[PDB]
């Protein structure tokens, strides 16, 4: 090909380089769902600046500052659950699907991942989850209230996908078993030498140091184990929508996140335990005691600890003048981050070097993807043809094949 130039309402010029274009074509053409359903792919999300509090790499104070210093006085903090991200689209019937999306295989809904591929291999499990979501939207009067035969939802899906839970076998536990055994043996040996007692080492410093390493490694192992439990049926899934993205005629990027939370709770979370309302608070980033509350709240979410919170501006799309701001900033839990920065990241000599991280590229990637997904929604809803929608969705894919710090 060459370079693809895409125009969006939020960024008039977004460039898709050939090599990102190719790298996407590979994964869009081989393993992806019916391109008719792909009206949206979620963006990657930036983290906060690093903290300086003791033992802390990410802390809510810097996420709050990001918005305060850019003139956003109100944020909505939403709980990050232990799960993948999944787009859920639900039609009333296969006739809606066929007529509105052009879907030709009789499917009445889809649940797909950020790569544009079915969350489930078992297609029956997909459809069972879709209609369960549909029954609820009936038992609330969604279709009527929104004057729509379809809905696109942005959601947390728990637990980890089956593909995701293999990493626990291929990777996480490998590090976990090797690290536990040797660090426990390291402590035992040093201890013995402690009692039977290049450059000079001190045995007791060594023992203390390896005692700390061993402890961090225990925590790491307890952190990943939680993400194991298999989907034997639909009663193992948990689903929490956080945006109503699109209904017939409208994109809901004008609606604030309280609206999204509340409106999802009334229409999608009533009388089923499979679809939950997400825990959230509102924080005034200008008030020390509102800020303090959000901190406490976050300390409690991650007490177990859960992954942390996603901090969003009050409105869906915000600008600081003409500069579009991040639609989201994650603040990840201290324990959870051992799964990302490694078992021993909280150790002093480590966390110190980790505090110097460059987030510029990642934020720039989150904004461009954010713009492209909004354009893809805005085009579908205004009934533009497939290629015009699809160039935006494919654009998201291509940018994701861009090299960036995997920990961010």
């Amino acid at each position: 090909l060459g370079k693809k130039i895409i125009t969006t309402r939020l960024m008039s010029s977004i460039t898709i380089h050939e090599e990102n274009s190719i790298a996407a074509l590979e994964v869009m053409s081989r393993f992806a769902a019916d391109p008719h359903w792909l009206i949206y792919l979620p963006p990657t999300m930036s983290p906060c600046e690093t903290s300086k509090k003791e033992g802390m790499l990410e802390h809510p104070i810097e996420a709050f500052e990001y918005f305060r210093t850019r003139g956003v006085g109100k944020v909505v903090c939403e709980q990050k659950h232990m799960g993948s991200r999944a787009v859920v689209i639900v039609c009333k019937d296969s006739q809606v699907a066929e007529k509105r999306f052009g879907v030709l295989d009789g499917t009445a809904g889809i649940c797909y991942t950020r790569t544009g591929r079915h969350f489930f291999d078992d297609m029956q499990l997909e459809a069972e989850l879709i209609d369960r979501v549909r029954k609820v939207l009936d038992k609330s009067g969604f279709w009527g209230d929104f004057n729509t035969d379809w809905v696109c939802l942005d959601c947390e899906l728990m637990p980890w996908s089956a593909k995701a839970q293999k990493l626990l076998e291929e990777q996480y536990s490998a590090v976990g078993i090797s690290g536990r055994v040797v660090l426990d043996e390291a402590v035992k040996l040093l201890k013995q030498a402690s009692l039977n007692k290049g450059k000079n080492a001190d045995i007791n410093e060594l023992l203390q140091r390896f005692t700390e390493r061993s402890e961090m490694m225990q925590k790491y192992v307890e952190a990943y184990r939680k993400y194991c439990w298999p989907v034997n049926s639909i009663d193992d899934l948990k689903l929490a929508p956080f945006h109503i993205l699109a209904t017939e005629g409208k994109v809901h990027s004008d609606k604030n996140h309280i609206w999204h939370m509340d409106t999802i709770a009334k229409y999608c979370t009533q009388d089923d335990s499979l679809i939950m309302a997400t825990n959230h608070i509102l924080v005034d980033v200008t008030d020390a005691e509102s800020v303090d509350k959000g901190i406490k709240w976050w300390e409690d979410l991650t007490a177990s600890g859960g992954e942390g919170m996603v901090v969003k501006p009050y409105d869906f799309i915000v600008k600081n003048g003409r500069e579009l701001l991040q639609p989201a900033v994650k603040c990840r839990g201290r324990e959870y981050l051992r799964i990302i920065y490694g078992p021993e990241y909280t150790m002093d000599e480590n966390i110190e070097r980790l505090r110097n991280r460059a987030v510029g590229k990642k934020r720039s990637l989150a904004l461009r993807e954010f713009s492209l997904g909004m354009e893809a929604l805005e085009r579908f809803v205004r009934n533009e043809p497939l290629y015009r929608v699809h160039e935006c969705v494919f654009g998201v894919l291509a940018l994701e094949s861009e090299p960036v710090d995997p920990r961010l």
Binding site: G176, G179, A186, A193, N196, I340, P406
Partner: protein, 206 residues
């Protein structure tokens, strides 16, 4: 990440002389991507054990290029530590006990957390021709979750009568043969003198 050697011929503390690390003097050596500690968990006349402890720095540098088993396995970094702490002992040179260094001593060794794609069978094939009685222990990836199955980590115990320098040279050469992904992350024949040419797996070792 741990090598231990054990000697029990009374005065066992003579193991110290052959290695040149005075048992009362724990030491730290600095490698690339970390450092190595040598100390003697036990030094009595009836029993003497040396311990070689890797201290690899995870930050010295996909998500799993930051979250890997490198700092916890007996990789090629183990060999590099051996040649660095027991430098001369691999040249047969001993002073205060020149004959102890001269003959086969009854010896035991333990290499923890050897990552071997080839499993038990490749560990025997490398070590039994050299006159070792070899014991191998394996690990499950996570005992909470037996359904994940075996890791490809093995802890190898060697028992044999051999010269100290052969033992160190055996381990030095044979460890990076099992480390399949060392390419991801020092000259041979000067280390295989006496045994390598005659080893059944020498093509495979080279």
């Amino acid at each position: 990440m741990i090598l231990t050697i054990t000697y029990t011929q009374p005065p066992a503390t003579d193991l110290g002389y052959l290695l040149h690390k005075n048992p009362s003097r724990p030491q730290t050596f600095e490698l690339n991507h970390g450092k190595a500690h040598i100390f003697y968990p036990e030094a009595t006349s009836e029993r003497c054990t040396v311990a070689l402890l890797l201290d690899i720095d995870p930050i010295d540098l996909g998500l799993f290029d930051y979250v890997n088993d490198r700092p916890y396995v007996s990789s090629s970094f183990m060999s590099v530590a051996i040649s660095r702490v027991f430098g001369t002992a691999m040249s047969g040179k001993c002073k205060e006990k020149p004959e102890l260094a001269a003959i086969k001593l009854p010896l035991k060794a333990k290499i923890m957390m050897l990552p071997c794609k080839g499993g038990e069978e490749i560990i025997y094939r490398l070590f039994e021709p050299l006159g070792y009685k070899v014991d191998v222990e394996g690990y499950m990836l996570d005992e909470k979750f037996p359904e994940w199955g075996k890791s490809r980590y093995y802890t190898v115990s060697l028992e044999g009568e051999v010269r100290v320098r052969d033992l160190l040279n055996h381990i030095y050469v044979l460890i990076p043969v099992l480390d399949s992904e060392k390419h991801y992350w020092d000259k041979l024949f000067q280390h295989g003198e006496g045994w390598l040419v005659d080893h059944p797996e020498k093509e495979l070792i080279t």
